[PDB]
Amino acid sequence: IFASIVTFSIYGFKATFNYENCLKKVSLLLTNTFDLEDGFLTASNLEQVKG
Amino acid sequence: NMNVRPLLNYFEPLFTWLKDQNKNSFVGWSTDWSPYADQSIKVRISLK
């Protein structure tokens, strides 16, 4: 159980990092395409801006 | 009111001549070409 705790902590960290990179790539692509102000397009308002 | 039909009636023969002469052409224009676009460089800055 202790080993599973230790391993899955780092596994969750890696998954979170990959998810953040996934968000960042899409955000950058949209910003470059539509010439939106940098930093204005955040993760929280992604769906509203998409619509 | 002011009418534009008289002018069209006056220039109708010239309109027909142009239409005959414009078969191998592209009527209209595109609002993106410029005499400096071929030698320009685009910059992109992201401060944040």
UniProtKB/Swiss-Prot annotation, chain A:
It comes from Homo sapiens. Mediates the Na(+)- and Cl(-)-dependent uptake of imino acids such as L-proline, N-methyl-L-proline and pipecolate as well as N-methylated amino acids. Also transports glycine, regulates proline and glycine homeostasis in the brain playing a role in the modulation of NMDAR currents. Kidney and small intestine. Expressed in the S3 segment of the proximal tubule. Expressed in neurons. It comes from the Eukaryota. It is linked to Hyperglycinuria: A condition characterized by excess of glycine in the urine. In some cases it is associated with renal colic and renal oxalate stones. Belongs to the sodium:neurotransmitter symporter (SNF) (TC 2.A.22) family. SLC6A20 subfamily. This is Sodium- and chloride-dependent transporter XTRP3. It is found in: Apical cell membrane.
Swiss-Prot record, chain B:
Proteolytic cleavage by ADAM17 generates a secreted form. Also cleaved by serine proteases: TMPRSS2, TMPRSS11D and HPN/TMPRSS1. An engeneered stable, dimeric and secreted receptor with combined mutations that increase the affinity for human coronavirus SARS-CoV-2 spike protein shows potent SARS-CoV and SARS-CoV-2 neutralization in vitro. Expressed in endothelial cells from small and large arteries, and in arterial smooth muscle cells (at protein level). Expressed in enterocytes of the small intestine, Leydig cells and Sertoli cells (at protein level). Expressed in the renal proximal tubule and the small intestine (at protein level). Expressed in heart, kidney, testis, and gastrointestinal system (at protein level). In lung, expressed at low levels in some alveolar type 2 cells, the expression seems to be individual-specific (at protein level). Expressed in nasal epithelial cells (at protein level). Coiled coil: none annotated. Induction: Up-regulated in failing heart. Expression is induced by IFNA and IFNG. Exposure to cigarette smoke increases expression in lungs. Expression is decreased in nasal and bronchial epithelium of individuals with allergy after allergen challenge. IL13 stimulation decreases expression in nasal and bronchial epithelium. (Microbial infection) In airway epithelial cells, expression is increased upon influenza A virus infection. It is found in: Cell membrane; Cytoplasm; Cell projection, Cilium; Apical cell membrane. The extracellular region of the ACE2 enzyme is composed of two domains. The first is a zinc metallopeptidase domain (residues 19-611). The second domain is located at the C-terminus (residues 612-740) and is 48% identical to human collectrin. The cytoplasmic tail contains several linear motifs such as LIR, PDZ-binding, PTB and endocytic sorting signal motifs that would allow interaction with proteins that mediate endocytic trafficking and autophagy. Homodimer. Interacts with the catalytically active form of TMPRSS2. Interacts with SLC6A19; this interaction is essential for expression and function of SLC6A19 in intestine. Interacts with ITGA5:ITGB1. Interacts (via PDZ-binding motif) with NHERF1 (via PDZ domains); the interaction may enhance ACE2 membrane residence. Belongs to the peptidase M2 family. This is Angiotensin-converting enzyme 2. The lineage of its organism: Eukaryota, Metazoa, Chordata, Craniata, Vertebrata. The chain holds residues 578 to 625 of 805 of the full protein.
